[PDB]
């Protein structure tokens, strides 16, 4: 029985037999579902977000929702596989980076591997989706697992940045230790939010200074900063 | 009715949905001027011929009931159409 996670992640999560049975159950649930339809991403890619660095070296946690549902998902949040157009939210993420970092120039691709290897965790809360059906796998058991990853990251890391974009990602702030960690919030990078009124609950994404504020926190905490260039 | 079909139905352009972002009623209402009855999926596609973002707002899965259509300018301006 494969829990799909790298040994470092298994060693980090200290999963109890109970939690191991939980993870295996969802994994199994998804295997069931695949015999019935196309499911993204591939099973050997659904946990790709965990294969880029030692979990204890995570410095920035960025939450997505579920994977892209048109074949573009690569097992990381926001990133797309080679050859696909850079999606609207990512284009907007590149804009905030370009607005705030003099040395960043938006790339022509959506591969975020260079961030991931530095300890930026690109984590969708839901790790699978049925082709053409956003939200289809929202209630199959992924949320307990990613809530658990979020909680353990908070618990085990001395200091880490969590970027929570939009009200839905914002709900996860309850899992995070705001004393130890920097919890950064704003509206989602989706083009829609751009035309929201002046007095919004959350600040605009374009202007949130999240990527600079992350490096400021890391620096003050005596940790390596992120080179955001792609 | 496929989500792709709705966009072409409404706009005549053949765009693939690139992302579907879930939003809560309050953050949607800040943009649309109308409050949805529940969560909203923001299905968005870029039209490179016009440099505009085309957004189909739908109810959450599995219904995907069409709610509004927004087209965003190269200049940031929103054209809103309740569905």
- Active-site residues of A: which are they? 66
Cα–Cα distance, B70 to B42 (Å, whole number): 10
Query: Distance (Å, rounded) from C-alpha A226 to C-alpha B14?
Result: 38
Contacts of A65 in chain B (CB under 8 A): 21-22
Asked if A138 and B61 come within 8 Å (Cβ–Cβ), the reply is yes
Find the DSSP H helices in B33-83: none
Helix (H, G, I), strand (E, B) or coil at A163: strand
Q: In order of start, what are the domains of chain A with their CATH numbers?
A: 1-230 (3.40.470.10)
CATH number of B1-83: 3.10.450.20
- The contacts of residue A61 (CB under 8 Å, 6+ apart) are A120, A121, A123, A150, A153, A160, A161, A162, A163
Beta bridge partners of A133: A130
Residue of B17, B24, B27, B70 to mutate for A, most A C-beta atoms under 10 A: B27
Residues B28, A188: contact at Cβ < 8 Å? no
> In Å, what is the CA distance from A113 to each residue of A50, A125, A139, A178?
11, 19, 28, 27
Contact B53 A191 (CB under 8 A): yes
Map out the domains of chain B as residue ranges.
1-83
Residue given tokens 């079909």 in the structure block: B5
End-to-end CA distance of chain B: 14
Spatial contact of A113 and A52, defined as CB atoms under 8 Å apart:
yes
Residue count of chain A: 230
Among residues A177, A182, A143, the alpha carbon closest in space to that of A162 is found at A182
Residues A60, A161 contacting (CB under 8 angstroms): yes
- Separation between Cα atoms, residue B34 and residue B70, nearest integer Å: 13
């Amino acid at each position: 029985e494969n829990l799909l996670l790298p040994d470092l992640w298994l060693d980090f999560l200290q999963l109890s037999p109970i939690f191991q049975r939980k993870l295996a159950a969802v994994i199994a649930c998804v295997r069931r579902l695949r015999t019935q339809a196309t499911v993204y991403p591939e099973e050997d890619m659904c946990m790709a977000w965990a294969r880029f660095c030692d979990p204890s070296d995570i410095k920035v946690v960025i939450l997505g929702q579920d994977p892209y549902h048109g074949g573009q998902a690569n097992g990381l949040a926001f990133s797309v596989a080679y050859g696909f157009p850079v999606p609207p939210s990512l284009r907007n993420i590149y804009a905030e980076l370009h607005r705030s970092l003099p040395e960043f120039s938006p790339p022509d691709h959506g591969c975020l591997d260079a961030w991931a290897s530095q300890g930026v965790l690109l984590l969708n809360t839901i790790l699978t989706v049925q082709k053409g059906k956003p939200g289809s796998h929202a209630d199959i058991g992924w949320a307990w697992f990613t809530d658990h990853v979020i909680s353990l990251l908070s618990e085990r890391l001395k200091a880490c940045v969590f970027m929570l974009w939009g009200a839905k990602a914002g709900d996860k702030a309850s899992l995070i230790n705001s004393k130890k960690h920097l919890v950064l919030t704003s509206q989602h990078p989706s083009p829609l939010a751009q035309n929201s009124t002046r007095k919004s609950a959350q600040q605009k994404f374009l202007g949130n200074n999240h990527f600079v504020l992350a490096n400021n926190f890391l620096r003050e905490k005596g940790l390596g900063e992120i080179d955001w260039r792609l | 009715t496929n989500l792709s079909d709705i966009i072409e139905k409404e706009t005549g352009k053949q765009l693939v949905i690139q992302e579907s972002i879930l939003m809560l009623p309050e953050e949607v209402e800040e943009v649309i001027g109308n409050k949805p009855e529940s969560d909203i999926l923001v299905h968005t596609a870029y039209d490179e011929s016009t440099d505009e973002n085309v957004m189909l707002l739908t109810s959450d899965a599995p219904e995907y009931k069409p709610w509004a259509l927004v087209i965003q300018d190269s200049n940031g301006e929103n054209k809103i159409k309740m569905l």
